[PDB]
Design a protein around this ligand. Structure first.
Ligand SMILES: O=[N+]([O-])c1ccc(O[C@H]2O[C@H](CO)[C@@H](O[C@H]3O[C@H](CO)[C@@H](O)[C@H](O)[C@H]3O)[C@H](O)[C@H]2O)cc1
Ligand SMILES: O=[N+]([O-])c1ccc(O[C@H]2O[C@H](CO)[C@@H](O[C@H]3O[C@H](CO)[C@@H](O)[C@H](O)[C@H]3O)[C@H](O)[C@H]2O)cc1
Ligand SMILES: O=[N+]([O-])c1ccc(O[C@H]2O[C@H](CO)[C@@H](O[C@H]3O[C@H](CO)[C@@H](O)[C@H](O)[C@H]3O)[C@H](O)[C@H]2O)cc1
Ligand SMILES: [Ca+2]
Ligand SMILES: [Ca+2]
Ligand SMILES: [Ca+2]
Ligand SMILES: [Ca+2]
Ligand SMILES: [Ca+2]
Ligand SMILES: [Ca+2]
Ligand SMILES: [Ca+2]
Ligand SMILES: [Ca+2]
Ligand SMILES: [Ca+2]
Lengths: 151, 151, 151
C-alpha cells in the first residue's frame, strides 16, 4: 500500500515540474527563440560566415536552421524579421553544384527559393540565406549572416 | 509480481530532474529575468515603441510588464536599474483619457506614479514608463523604451 | 494491482518531460553558456568591476566562474573567446596577499597562471582574469571585465 502512496507522491512532484517548466519555456524563448512543432530555432543575435556559424551550432549540440516545411520557414522568418538580418540556412551545393543538401547529404524536402533562385551568381554561391521576406537565395558562403541554430 | 522495480527508477529520475531543473532556472533568469511570486519578468535588452514592444510580448505568450504590487514593482525595478533604461508597462489610457487600464480593460489595482503623474503632457501621453527609481510616468507611446514582458 | 498503468503512465510523463527539458537546455546554453560536468557557465554578455560582478552572480543564486580543472577552464575559455573579452574569476588574494582562495576561503585546487603571474602588479592586483587564450592573470579588482557566473 505504501507503493500506491509512493506513486501519489511522484504525481505531485511531476505536476509541479510540468507546470513550472511550461512557464519557463515561454520565458526562455523570449526574444531570441521560436518553437514550431517539435523543433526550436534560436538565434545568437550576431552574424558570422557560414563555416563559423555552422561550427557554433554543431558545437552547441544542434545545427544551422534547416526549415523542412512552410510552418518551420515562417517560424524562422519571425526571428530574421525581428533581428532584421538575413540568416544562413544549413544547406549547400558545395559537393555537387546545383544539388542542395542538408548537412547529412539528404536532398531537400522543402524549399522557398525567391524567383530565379538558386542562380549560383558569379559562379560561386553555394550557401543559402533567408531574407526578411522569408524567401531563399543561394549566396556566397564567405558572407556574414545572422546565426540561427535549430535544436 | 509487485516488482515495483519501476517505481524505483521513476523516483531517481524525478529527483535528478528537480535538481537539474532548479539549476536551469537560475541559468535562465541570469541576467535578464526576475522571479516574484508566480510571475516572471524578462527584458529583451533593447528598446522599442509601445505597439512593437506589446506585440513582442503577446507573440511570446506573455504581455508587457504589469506590476500589481509593491513587490512586483520592486522586482521589475531591478531589471530597469540593471539595463539603466526606463521600460514600458502594459497599461494605457488610450480608450478613455485620464483612466489607465490593463490590457484586459480592468482598472489599476496598484500604482506607483511619480509626483504629478500622470499628466498627459502635451496632451499626448497614453502609455506608461517606469524609471530606474521605480516611479511611473505617462509617456508618449511612440517613444522607445526597454521591452520587459511578464510570464 | 492496477497501479501498473499509473506508474507506467508516469514513466511516459517523466520521460517526455526529460526529453523536452533536454532540448530546452541546449537552447538555453546557445550562445552564452557552456556545460561541463555538472557545472554550467553563463555570461551576462557585458563587463563590470569585480564587486559588481560578484554581487550579480551571488544574487542570481550562483557565483563568479571558478574553474577547478583543465576541462572547466577550457569550457570557460570558449565563452571568453566568443565574446573576445577577458573575464573575472571568483578567486582573490585579498585576505592574504599571494594566496588566492575561492569565496569560501578554500585554497586553489587548480590554476592556469600565464608565465610570470600572479605578480601583484602595482602592488594591488587581488582579483583574477582569464584571457582569451585561457591563461590567468591577477588584475586590479576595480577594472571592468566580462561577467560570467557558474551554476
Ligand atoms: O525581404 N527582403 O528584405 C529582401 C531584401 C532584398 C532583396 O533583394 C535585393 O538584394 C539582393 C541581394 O541582397 C539581390 O540579390 C542579387 O544579388 C545576390 C548576390 O549578388 C544574388 O545571390 C541574387 O541571386 C541576386 O538576385 C536582389 O536581386 C535584390 O532585389 C529581397 C528581399
Ligand atoms: O529615476 N530616474 O532615473 C529618473 C530619471 C529622470 C527623471 O526625470 C527627468 O526626466 C523626465 C523625462 O525623462 C522628465 O519628465 C518630464 O517630461 C516627460 C516627457 O518627456 C513628461 O511625460 C513628464 O510628465 C515631465 O515631468 C522629468 O521632469 C525630469 O525631472 C526621474 C527619475
Ligand atoms: O590571450 N590573450 O588574448 C591575451 C591578450 C593579452 C595578453 O597580454 C598583454 O596585455 C596584458 C594586459 O591585458 C599585459 O599584462 C601586464 O599588465 C597587467 C595589468 O594591466 C598586469 O596584471 C600583468 O601582470 C602585466 O604583465 C601583458 O604583459 C601583455 O603582453 C596575453 C594574452
Ligand atoms: Ca559550387
Ligand atoms: Ca552553387
Ligand atoms: Ca543567388
Ligand atoms: Ca489620450
Ligand atoms: Ca493620457
Ligand atoms: Ca508624464
Ligand atoms: Ca593585495
Ligand atoms: Ca594580490
Ligand atoms: Ca598580474
Amino acid at each position: 500500500a505504501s507503493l500506491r502512496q509512493q506513486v501519489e507522491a511522484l504525481q505531485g512532484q511531476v505536476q509541479h515540474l510540468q507546470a513550472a517548466f511550461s512557464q519557463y519555456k515561454k520565458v526562455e524563448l523570449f526574444p531570441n527563440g521560436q518553437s514550431v512543432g517539435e523543433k526550436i530555432f534560436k538565434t545568437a543575435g550576431f552574424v558570422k560566415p557560414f563555416t563559423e556559424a555552422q561550427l557554433l551550432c554543431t558545437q552547441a549540440g544542434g545545427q544551422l536552421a534547416s526549415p523542412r516545411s512552410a510552418a518551420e520557414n515562417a517560424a524562422l522568418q519571425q526571428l530574421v524579421v525581428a533581428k532584421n538580418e538575413a540568416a544562413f540556412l544549413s544547406m549547400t551545393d558545395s559537393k555537387t553544384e546545383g544539388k542542395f543538401t542538408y548537412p547529412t547529404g539528404e536532398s531537400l524536402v522543402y524549399s522557398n527559393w525567391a524567383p530565379g533562385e538558386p542562380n549560383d551568381d558569379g559562379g560561386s554561391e553555394d550557401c543559402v540565406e533567408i531574407f526578411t521576406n522569408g524567401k531563399w537565395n543561394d549566396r556566397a558562403c564567405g558572407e556574414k549572416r545572422l546565426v540561427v541554430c535549430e535544436f
